[PDB]
Paper text:
DHS (EC: 2.5.1.46) is a cytosolic transferase involved in the first enzymatic step of the unique post-translational modification of eIF5A. DHS catalyses the transfer of 4-aminobutyl moiety of spermidine (SPD) to a specific lysine of eIF5A precursor, which results in deoxyhypusine formation. For its catalytic activity, the enzyme requires nicotinamide adenine dinucleotide (NAD) as a co-factor. In physiological conditions, DHS forms a homotetramer.
Also, the structure of apo DHS reported herein is the first structure solved in the absence of the co-factor NAD. DHS crystallised in the P3221 space group with one tightly associated homodimer per asymmetric unit (ASU), with two active sites located at the dimer interface. In the refined structure, the electron density clearly defines the residues ranging from Ser28 to Met363. The loop containing residues 79–83 in chain A is poorly ordered compared to the rest of the protein, so these residues were not built due to insufficient definition by electron density. The core of DHS consists of five parallel beta-strands (S1, S2, S5, S6, S7) forming a Rossmann fold that is conserved in proteins that bind nucleotide co-factors. Using PDBePISA analysis, we calculated the total buried area of the apo DHS tetramer to equal 34,410 Å2, with a corresponding ΔGint of −73.6 kcal/mol. The same is true for all of the five complexes analysed in this work. This analysis suggests that the tetramer form is significantly more stable than any of the isolated dimers, and it is in agreement with the previous findings. The DHS dimer present in the ASU has two major interfaces formed between chains A and B (A:B) and between chain A and a symmetry-related chain B (A:B′). The A:B interface of 2822 Å2 and ΔGi of −21.4 kcal/mol involves 17 H-bonds and 16 salt bridges. This interface forms a binding pocket for NAD and SPD.
Numbering used by the authors:
A (entry chain B), C (entry chain B): 28 to 363
B (entry chain A), D (entry chain A): 28 to 78, 84 to 363
Amino acid sequence: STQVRGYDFNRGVNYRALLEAFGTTGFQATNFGRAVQQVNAMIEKKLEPLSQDEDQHADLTQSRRPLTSCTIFLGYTSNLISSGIRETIRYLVQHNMVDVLVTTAGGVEEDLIKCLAPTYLGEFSLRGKELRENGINRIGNLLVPNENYCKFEDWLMPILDQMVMEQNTEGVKWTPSKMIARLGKEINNPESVYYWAQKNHIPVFSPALTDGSLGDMIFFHSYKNPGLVLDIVEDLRLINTQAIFAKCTGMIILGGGVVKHHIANANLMRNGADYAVYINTAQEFDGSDSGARPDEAVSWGKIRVDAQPVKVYADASLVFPLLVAETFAQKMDAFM
Amino acid sequence: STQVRGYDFNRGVNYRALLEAFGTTGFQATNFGRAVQQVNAMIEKKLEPLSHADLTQSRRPLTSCTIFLGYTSNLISSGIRETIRYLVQHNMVDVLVTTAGGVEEDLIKCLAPTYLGEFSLRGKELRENGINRIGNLLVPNENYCKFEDWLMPILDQMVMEQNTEGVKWTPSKMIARLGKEINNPESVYYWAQKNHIPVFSPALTDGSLGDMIFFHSYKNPGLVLDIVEDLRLINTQAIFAKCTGMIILGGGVVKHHIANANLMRNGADYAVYINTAQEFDGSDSGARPDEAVSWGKIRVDAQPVKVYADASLVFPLLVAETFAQKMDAFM
Amino acid sequence: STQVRGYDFNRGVNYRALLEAFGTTGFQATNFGRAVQQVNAMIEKKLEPLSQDEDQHADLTQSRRPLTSCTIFLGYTSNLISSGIRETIRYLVQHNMVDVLVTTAGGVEEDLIKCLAPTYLGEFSLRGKELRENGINRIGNLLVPNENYCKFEDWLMPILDQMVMEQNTEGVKWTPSKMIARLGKEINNPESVYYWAQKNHIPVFSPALTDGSLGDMIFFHSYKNPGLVLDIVEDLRLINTQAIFAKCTGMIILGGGVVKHHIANANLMRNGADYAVYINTAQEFDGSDSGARPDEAVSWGKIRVDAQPVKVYADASLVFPLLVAETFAQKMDAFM
Amino acid sequence: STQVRGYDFNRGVNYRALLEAFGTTGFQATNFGRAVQQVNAMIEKKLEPLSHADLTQSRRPLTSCTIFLGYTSNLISSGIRETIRYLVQHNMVDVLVTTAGGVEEDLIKCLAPTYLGEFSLRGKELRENGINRIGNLLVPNENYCKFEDWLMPILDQMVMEQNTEGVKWTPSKMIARLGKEINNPESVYYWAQKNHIPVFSPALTDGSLGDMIFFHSYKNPGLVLDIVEDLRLINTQAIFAKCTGMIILGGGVVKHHIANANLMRNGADYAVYINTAQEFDGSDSGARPDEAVSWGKIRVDAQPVKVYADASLVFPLLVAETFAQKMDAFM
């Protein structure tokens, strides 16, 4: 039995003690503390060695990524890549702290575009008419100029030319994950999430990669240079194989939609994730998968019955940097 | 202005008058009334006489308003499946967009039913009894066994047709085929293929159909689903429309993909959203329609509406006051 | 076991069948159907006769209201009285369909003001600066002119003069419920909820009655005519007594805050309500009473363990007229 | 302007820098940064030297900014009780507004603790074991038995003082007395009465304290709690302030009552809201600060901020970056 007690600022501003006191504060502060515990459990498992038997089984994929004792799936929605959480995610990928990424089309393209031009702070209440007249697009309380996509087009079209040529003359069979790896290699910029992902052999899955500006540009490109194919079936085999041959898995899911469902569905193939943390603001009452509690996924076998999953009901822009500070960042030396 | 006033039950109960009174009741009741007006504007425009197939690569004839209907998977698990099936059966909408679950659960419902449960049922006990929870709904594991048995011979034919008849499969082409195969008038996708209403679902692998494709590929390798051609197909539906309307139930890719197609024509002329998402986390799912105006996904002169509500409650009422009143004009 | 099935519009627009089909539609449509059942259970109980023994016990209050077999508490927030749901509530009170009202200060004063001047439709996005400059106040997507409160002041001050005189010369001991009854008698208008409540001996509780325009006016009035006292302790005895000596109770609670907690707390005094329907958009995750599920109240004894309470997660402006259409309005003849 | 950029953990972990980076991270992180700026503006104004007691009927000296702090009952059940107690202990705010639960649970915590539980615990089992649920917190029935035993002799004295010493009780006067009686430095209300910080709670009867007053009145009749004099007291705090700031955690009466007092001076100069309510149902709880601007509850030249978040997460971080940095100036 654990008593409720908040941090006592008469002790001064001891930030580490303040964060640890969330666990006994109640409501979503307590869920934050539980999330720290769950993520630290994933990390402690990941750093355990593989036994001979575990190594044999985990080695049964054609993946270049070194084996570890816990394969961590990180999912996030496009808005988080527009936000400063892009830097948080890039750090984790840079230092091989996660093993598989899942995101939406916007979550791919906006990382690359940020290497060409920035996103700016705005306000939620800015009116669309006046923004449109000024060539400014709104993302929550963030703003991106139209010219950002012009720059993206100039950068991307010559790459699409090469990809079509490689498909038609060198037998390349493109999928979303293969395309994302190539784009990360091309951007060649250490501020990019996808640069680090391809450098570190972290695959990125995005089965609806066409739903955004990258798709727009493939669309226009296809009328002058037709025939590019992105197969989603091979990518399904690839993500599912990462779950099936994992020793243990953890899911860290920021937001809802496909990123949440696709990571969870991959883990159904192994009979469930061993660890899981959700951070989102969706609610269960409309029946949506996005708003379902982790315990819904337990009924399906997407999360193991003996797991202790956690959902933090909060905007991940507030919580995720704090979570990383208390978990992965404390074990940085082990990942270097 | 317009004064607030609710329905007066001293009149007795006339349901049409009760629904009409929502417009002057305030808060989301007023937004419901606004949504009725917008959908009726879409319908009236669609019924205006017109004075294409090679640029769209579609056999569907153009009308004066191309209506895109998008909905999330949970709504197909719900009774709203019947509402959507009605609209598609009578050719009242032109393009469907849904998630993988929104395809497969319509087909599975032709094989076995979904049941009522409760949100609070615990996962451990359900899993031990072979029952999967979908909100306050329940589906037995056996539903997916029946789906597997039904689907595997169709996948065999699809691979054979790809490799020897030159078929280039995409999600929309697969969904048309599955609707033809299920051959059941309770099915949304049966009616969609019969009426040449395309269905787009770029992440069609993210669900049980994906599971089945995956398992099948180790018995019969080689199936390819291309998403690029499907982007061309949906985008050209918007580009060559005379007018467009968007009716979007929920968030995620169904919302973004319909709106992105309409960005290609510099915006939809009419738009109604029904969902429970909120803007404050910056998500596209939760964004107000006026965010889409800044992008050009909705025209500046449009009068879009969002109803903040569970569509299981609101969408049947909306259909009752719009499409179902115009049933004669659609025959 | 009940199968999911929605209304089939191939049958035509049969509105009663459409509403009944909510029960098998799922998510909050199913909760709506469950709410119809719960409210119809309250009504069927209310119309049962009292046995000799039940009558003896129910008669143990000094209340003028006739005894029934189910005392129904109706709570609602101020915004709903600004909305058209004011008419829904007035109808129930007019026809003696509920027994006790609980609301906030705004929920009292805005009913009275609507008898003097209307509320208008606006938009949520209208900016406060320009509204303030034009003397217009915003309530969600509704609008009220400043002059509404000027009219209220002119109407109310002479009544406050009389109330102070009656306190000081006739020994009247005012409470919120006694004041609300007097204001309803004074407004003398069949469009008013509180007119009908006092005519029908339905008490209205509002322990924070001072938190609004009526309080503002009492405040100003007290400097020229000091000494008005509103005692909340006597009103606590009065509401609690209505629960303690009820044969059965039902709670219909629209929204959160004090109206929700005060009705539930009264029912703790009898060891719990027999029937309960909540309609609100609040969520549980921040720990608030407003967003708590009915099953939280079961732990306290505010709702009986054998009850089948229901929450509908929706804006009551959409749901409550539909609920009334399917329940109370179907038994109108019995209440006349 | 300002570019978006998050904290770079390649720097290591400096928590001050991490919190500062929220301002440029976007969405509610940006609103948190804005809230820090607004609260620091309140504090800096409060610390400006000044160049009252009869018109306010208060002994509390005026400062250059009168800060109203409002919070709901659940936050006193939570660990935020310690956060609030710290601010009141050091005289950092001037007026408190809370619900009945927000008074009684502070006092009860001096007699017995609240425990961690889970939101999903079922009411039947908890009730059978004499445990009451508050979100994911738990309190045994015995806590209220201890409260009763502690409170009944105090109520006896209060009635005696009303009837023979002319005391005219109101909620704020009762809350001051209960804080003096609990005589425990862990208590918010102990520190509030010691520092002459009034506490307003117009529906003080809506809770366990009400229960106890009710039961007590059948053993010792006659206690009166007047809410009208307390309206005069809170309103005059706003009317005669030099500047005001509002820090409001949650909704309901605590939010509306603080804002109504500030309407009396044609608006607060600074305002920060932290709550999870949404606007779409028209509720005051969910209204954006800009609704209060239309009424005159917030000045038009103010720069109010709402953080859409559970205050159990955000309020300790906010205090860490504002009041707790200025601790030396408050001594």
